[PDB]
Design a protein around this ligand. Structure first.
Ligand code: TAC
Ligand code: TAC
Ligand code: CL
Ligand code: CL
Ligand code: CL
Ligand code: CL
Ligand code: CL
Ligand code: CL
Ligand code: MG
Ligand code: MG
Lengths: 199, 199
């Protein structure tokens, strides 16, 4: 079938959904695409190239709150950005695993530069803004990965743990995520406010 | 060589370090152990059983701050617990990937019950204590996974991003981690303090 970049990526996401990350392979991608393996190699050199591309494209397709609204607070932007990031990572099987350890792509440069500038224009040093952005990224990735890999795994408890497991089993993870997110955002705010005060 | 549980686990961690998680296999474990594959199967049924075991044993061996000190504050316990958790996850290649989505093992029941009880004895509802514990777990896992998978990957920047990448490349990740951790802990504290007040 068609082997332009857009089409190869569509097929790879479809396969990622069916097989997960560890099961995703170029041989299986060639099969899905109805092509021989040397044909594929012309377009896709290895699994890493594919993974890097999929991490960019998953956000390009499903991460719709990458930029703050006009007049939006930094707190609100981090909240909205994190919810959007989480949704995007949850959309394909092992999506968060595909996103791990990637670095900004050239096609994302304008966008993440704006993100970083925004934090600095709200009083953060680049480092402190970066640390806030990174903590949000990390917390969100961890929460999605635990949620997803828990599912992968599924394929005389003491009382508080029993109840804790009931609590976790009662929700997809969004409740704990949204709660932890408010804690994180407010902690950043306390830090930012304090300036040189002992806090 | 010897195939008791302890020995199989030693070999599997050694192999995890050499090959990472996706490359870890029972065939390769059998090779390391100097045994045939049906011999191994008697002791280890599949890769999942091995992964579940390794997640328990990595913490058993290297997570030394699982319990609060006498009179220790909940803030200090979460801090100390998180640093210890992070160190443990960093000790083997893809350690954090091995830990993902696991649930408490029977051998950890006493310990995590104590953790949960401790939070409740400091004023948290079980749910809020759980949400705090989970946010710490998630933030720490995400930060370790990004650090580690970044390394795996390695095998006209705009100015703020250039500097941000210099900042990240200058440290192993501990600085941003410790900073984000204080933000998280203080956010929990603000929440706990507020009780029914609008906050
Ligand atoms: C907070 N939120 C989840 C962010 C986001 O919305 C992104 C996006 N594509 O819109 C990221 O790329 C974002 O998710 C993300 O992945 C970010 C990063 O990876 C980095 C890295 O690795 C190094 C320097 C700077 C960044 C960053 C500023 O681009 C990060 C922004 C992250
Ligand atoms: C915060 N810190 C990293 C904790 C920890 O020190 C643990 C340990 N072995 O000592 C965990 O097991 C700990 O790391 C961890 O993994 C915990 C959990 O997985 C769960 C799950 O999944 C469900 C209910 C309860 C727990 C928990 C209370 O046992 C969690 C405690 C985590
Ligand atoms: Cl076609
Ligand atoms: Cl074509
Ligand atoms: Cl492959
Ligand atoms: Cl021996
Ligand atoms: Cl033996
Ligand atoms: Cl295997
Ligand atoms: Mg990233
Ligand atoms: Mg866990």
């Amino acid at each position: 079938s068609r082997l332009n970049r857009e089409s190869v990526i569509d097929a790879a996401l479809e396969l990622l959904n069916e097989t997960g990350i560890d099961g995703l392979t170029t041989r299986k991608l060639a099969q899905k695409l109805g092509i021989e393996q040397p044909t594929l190699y012309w377009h896709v050199k290895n699994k890493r190239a594919l993974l890097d591309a999929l991490a960019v494209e998953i956000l390009a397709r499903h991460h719709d709150y990458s930029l703050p609204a006009a007049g939006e607070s930094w707190q609100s932007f981090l909240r909205n950005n994190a919810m959007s990031f989480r949704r995007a990572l949850l959309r394909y099987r092992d999506g968060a695993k595909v996103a791990l350890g990637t670095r900004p792509d050239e096609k994302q440069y304008d966008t993440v530069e704006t993100q970083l500038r925004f934090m600095t224009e709200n009083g953060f040093s680049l480092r402190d803004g970066l640390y806030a952005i990174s903590a949000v990224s990390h917390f969100t990735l961890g929460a999605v990965l635990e949620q997803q890999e828990h599912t992968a795994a599924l394929t005389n408890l003491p009382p508080l743990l029993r109840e804790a497991l009931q609590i976790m089993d009662s929700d997809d993870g969004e409740q704990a995520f949204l709660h932890g997110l408010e804690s994180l955002i407010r902690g950043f705010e306390v830090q930012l406010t304090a300036l040189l005060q002992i806090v």
